[PDB]
A paper describes a structure:
The bifunctional enzyme Δ1-pyrroline-5-carboxylate synthase ([name]) is vital to the synthesis of proline and ornithine, playing an essential role in human health and agriculture. The [name] molecule contains two domains, GK and GPR, catalyzing the first and second steps in the biosynthesis of proline from glutamate. The GK domain catalyzes glutamate phosphorylation, and the GPR domain catalyzes the NADPH-dependent reduction of γ-glutamyl phosphate (G5P) to glutamate-γ-semialdehyde (GSA). Our results describe the assembly mechanism of [name] filaments, in which the GK domain forms tetramer and the GPR domain forms dimer structure, and both domains form specific interaction interfaces.
In the P5CSGlu/ATPγS filament, the ligands could not be determined due to incomplete densities. The GK domain structure of the P5CSGlu/ATPγS filament is virtually identical to that of the P5CSMix filament. We speculate that there are two ligand-binding modes (bound with Glu-Mg-ATPγS and G5P-Mg-ADP, respectively) in the P5CSGlu/ATPγS filament. These two modes may coexist in the active sites of the GK tetramer, thereby affecting the 3D reconstruction of the structures. The unexpected presence of G5P could be due to the contamination of ATP in the commercial ATPγS (80% pure) and all substrates were in excess during our sample preparation. Thus, no ligand was modeled in the GK domain structure of the P5CSGlu/ATPγS filament. In P5CSGlu/ATPγS and P5CSMix filaments, the additional interface between hook structures pairs locks adjacent GK tetramers.
Residue numbers in the entry:
A (entry chain A): 45 to 128, 141 to 212, 229 to 276, 296 to 338
B (entry chain E): 115 to 127
The structure:
């Protein structure tokens, strides 16, 4: 909890963006949200060509894989039949997503590095320390290691891309940790009920537990709205967006 | 019209 106010976010040195799955894929499930994806890549490249050391934790590989595999299944039927999986989709989606990120980042000079982790990799101490060394070595060379879960051969208290992001932010000792989710923030009761209020400053449920854990270890977690324009640039810019987590 | 109706959608493209 080094930071304590939304003006001390200008001096965040190492932040860990975390893209949800509602951010990348659209509601139609007919492609990507290329607008939001390219805008987030633009903001990350602009806040990384500035001096900070950012390292995204992407997500939403299975959705891309589902789209690609549905197309391949349609395009491989007999015209007699036309007139009347987690892992395969994860593999296809991971390949395609890294290709897209690579193109969008190389348009800015930056370089990315796909680092896929699993769940047991956080249990074995040797592997965990080796992974920390790898991540620090990648960050110090001005690379943007785009972490993700090895969902193609072993699908997954790490149980998501959220708790994994909190663990990474705790281990790599990051200042900020942006949990770009689908909701606009945190309320004391869901919007379709009484008491609709935003909790801009959090005093002292999965996202909430992950944020609490990462707050009790040095990081300062922020939960933003993914479908909001200019999320990261204003979260860092100091404006009151999302719900900031301090004591 | 007896064969081409029983090809995969990929071959006929």
């Amino acid at each position: 909890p080094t930071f304590t106010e939304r003006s001390q976010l200008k001096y965040a040195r190492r932040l860990v963006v975390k893209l949800g799955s509602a951010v990348i894929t659209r509601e139609d499930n007919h492609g990507l949200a290329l607008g939001r994806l390219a805008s987030i890549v633009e903001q990350v490249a602009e806040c990384h060509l500035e001096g900070r050391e950012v390292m995204m934790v992407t997500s939403g590989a299975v959705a891309f894989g589902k789209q690609k595999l549905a197309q391949e299944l349609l395009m491989s039927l007999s015209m007699r039949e036309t007139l009347n999986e987690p892992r395969a989709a994860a593999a296809v989606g991971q390949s395609g997503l890294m290709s897209l990120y690579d193109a969008m980042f190389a348009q800015y000079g930056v370089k990315i590095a796909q680092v896929l982790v699993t769940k047991p990799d956080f249990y074995n101490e040797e592997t965990r320390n080796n992974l920390f060394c790898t991540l620090s070595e990648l960050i110090s060379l001005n690379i943007v290691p785009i972490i993700n879960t090895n969902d193609a051969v072993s699908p997954p208290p790490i149980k998501d891309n959220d708790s994994l992001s909190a663990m990474l932010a705790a281990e790599v000792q990051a200042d900020l940790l942006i949990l770009m989710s689908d909701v606009d923030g945190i309320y004391n009761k869901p919007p379709w009920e009484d008491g609709a209020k935003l909790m801009h400053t959090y005093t002292s449920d999965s996202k909430v537990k992950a944020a609490t854990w990462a707050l009790d270890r040095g990081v300062s977690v922020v939960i933003c709205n993914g479908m909001q324009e200019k999320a990261i640039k204003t979260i860092i810019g100091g404006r009151k967006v999302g719900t900031f987590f301090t004591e």
